[PDB]
């Protein structure tokens, strides 16, 4: 706690916070856990005008060497007064974000900075990769019923999902193209993508080093219950650099790329905080290891 | 439509009004992008490649220069968890439009990427670390921190961390535990009470447009009005303001600054979408002009 060189931002109850904290302890580095979730009520943060004047529970933390950013963060208070509650959350979150922005400015290697949030915007992240020579699904974010009917008339079998996440993907069928609900794009835009058929592959990239590429297939084992099987795989070096270009162009140090397979893969999303324990166990592959490696590197 | 100069805001906005009428006075009709009417009365379509941006069928892949003025009740009281998600979907699409343009090479006059460096607890640190004078400040939820700050600094003020309320002066009743201990609900910004003259410096593309002193005069019973009159600043200060605008990453900027007890300036804040109409008049400065000229210069 007096050695704030490596900071893990997140709750000690979070599994990945535990995994990274332990995997670092095993290498002789006891990280500082910045439990943001408990900030205003049971922790103090104080900022001076000088960038270095950052104080957490009285202790100064001007510039960590590296930060693993898992999360920054009884809400019936919203059901009471939404406006006050929103402004208060904004005060909270502004202070925390300022802490992390100051660390990045001072020179801390934040593993996925909160700046990349801009370049993670789905409709922009895709266009970013696409206009850089990367394969992506024929996509379409719209609020026009007619626009999507031409999208359908062109690409045929396709699906729809939320623009910013918040619901599981649903296959677009003809009853959705009905004037009953296709007019409801009036209330909010929707993402429509072509229906890719090949396999789901996930590629971890940590500081311009493809750590692995894992296949995720499913086996149906019970009534409406299926389980994933992860398989360590090797990838064309062309794509083991095509990926690295995506990570560096979006601005992520540690990323989990999501590709889906024609018979050749296309990039769907880069994840600014992908989990790993699921894959770490379903294919006995190591990701926490290289993450801790990259973290302890910045201390030298 | 000639989508080389786009003005994002509502035609009812007096500022987009000024900018559009100035651009017209110079041989360009902008495409006003009234984004209030996004969900309902307007269609936007984005494809996988960045050029495929369509507003009402008409595509707008790459303007020369954007002037961003804004990007934008009971539906909340009823169901709040879905209202927020709906607003976020609309907002994400609009922001993707703006980011795509900037990535093409559009001169977005103040991009939304600035909203990062805009946050006061980081912007003041940026300016302070670059050697520019900022006021002594403390952003905190720590009553002991506030007590030490008040003792160190003297007269203080407190304002929200991200704005939203009139700043008030710190009094002893506020340091009483009754009030002070409410800092556990959300943090607060405390600052030294600067006691000088309000000054505002306008900067477009690393050129200082003018510097205006803002005073107030009592015209009616408990009613004041602002008098905004021009002053001259040294080339020293002019270069500092240009550097501050560049540090925060803004093209059009109205810098709020202020003398203190010493008659020397402190940058208070840099606005990412400052107004200018109330300033141009009595000062006989023209800001709308230089802004429109800078816009046309990108075409």
């Amino acid at each position: 706690n007096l050695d704030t060189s490596i900071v893990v931002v997140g709750s000690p109850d979070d599994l990945h916070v535990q995994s990274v904290t332990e995997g670092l302890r095993a290498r002789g580095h006891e990280p500082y856990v910045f439990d943001t979730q408990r900030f205003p009520e049971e922790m103090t943060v104080s900022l001076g005008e000088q960038g270095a004047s950052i104080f957490v529970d009285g202790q100064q933390i001007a510039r960590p060497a590296a930060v693993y950013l898992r999360s920054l963060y009884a809400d019936k208070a919203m059901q009471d007064n939404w406006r006050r509650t929103l402004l208060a959350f904004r005060e909270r979150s502004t202070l925390m974000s300022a802490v992390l922005l100051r660390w990045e400015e001072a020179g801390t290697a934040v593993y996925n900075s909160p700046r990349a949030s801009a370049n993670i915007t789905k409709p922009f992240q895709l266009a970013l990769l696409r206009d850089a020579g990367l394969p992506v699904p024929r996509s379409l974010w719209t609020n026009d019923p007619e626009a999507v009917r031409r999208f359908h008339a062109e690409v045929g079998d396709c699906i729809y999902k939320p623009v910013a996440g918040g619901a599981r993907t649903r296959k677009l069928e003809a009853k959705d193209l009905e004037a009953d609900r296709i007019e409801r794009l009036s209330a909010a835009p929707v993402c429509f993508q072509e229906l890719l058929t090949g396999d789901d592959v996930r590629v971890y990239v940590i500081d311009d080093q493809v750590i692995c590429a894992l296949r995720i297939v499913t086996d149906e084992i019970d009534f409406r219950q299926a389980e994933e099987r992860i398989e360590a795989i090797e990838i064309s070096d062309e794509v083991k650099d095509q990926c690295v270009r995506a990570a560096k162009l979006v601005g992520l140090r540690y990323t989990g790329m999501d590709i889906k397979a024609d018979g050749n893969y296309r990039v769907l999303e880069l994840n600014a905080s992908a989990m790993f324990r699921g894959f770490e166990g379903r294919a006995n592959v190591d990701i926490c290891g290289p993450l801790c490696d990259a973290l302890i590197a910045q201390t030298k | 439509l000639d989508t080389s100069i786009v003005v994002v805001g509502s035609p009812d906005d007096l500022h987009v009004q000024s900018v559009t009428e100035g651009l017209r006075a110079r041989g360009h009709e902008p495409y006003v992008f009234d984004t209030q009417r996004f969900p309902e009365e307007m269609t936007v379509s984005l494809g996988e490649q960045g050029a495929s941006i369509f507003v009402d069928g008409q595509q707008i892949a790459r303007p020369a220069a954007v002037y961003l003025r804004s990007l934008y009740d009971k539906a909340m009281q009823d169901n709040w968890r879905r209202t927020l998600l709906a607003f976020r979907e609309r907002s994400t699409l609009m922001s993707a439009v703006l980011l795509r343009w900037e990535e093409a090479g559009t001169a977005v006059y103040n991009s939304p990427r600035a909203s990062a460096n805009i946050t006061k607890p980081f912007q003041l640190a940026l300016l302070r670390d670059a050697g520019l004078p900022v006021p002594r400040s403390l952003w905190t939820n720590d009553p002991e921190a506030v007590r030490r700050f008040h003792a160190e600094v003297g007269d203080c003020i407190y304002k929200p961390v991200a704005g939203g309320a009139r700043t008030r002066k710190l009094e002893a009743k506020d340091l009483e535990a009754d009030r002070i201990e409410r800092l556990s609900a959300a943090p607060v910004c405390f600052q030294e009470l600067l006691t000088g003259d309000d000054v505002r410096v306008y900067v477009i593309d690393d050129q200082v447009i003018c510097a205006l002193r803002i005073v107030t005069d009592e015209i009616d019973f408990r009613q004041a009005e602002e008098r905004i009159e021009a002053i001259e600043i040294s080339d020293e200060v002019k270069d500092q303001c240009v550097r501050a605008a560049k540090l925060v990453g803004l093209r059009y900027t109205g810098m709020d600054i202020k003398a203190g007890a010493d008659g020397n300036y402190r940058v208070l804040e840099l606005n990412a979408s400052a107004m200018f109409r109330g300033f141009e008049g009595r000062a006989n400065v023209d800001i709308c002009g230089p802004l429109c000229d800078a816009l046309i210069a990108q075409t």
Binding site: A88 | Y158, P160, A165, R182, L183, A186
Partner: peptide, 6 residues
């Protein structure tokens, strides 16, 4: 809240 005007 502390800022009573929010």
């Amino acid at each position: 809240l502390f800022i009573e005007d929010l």
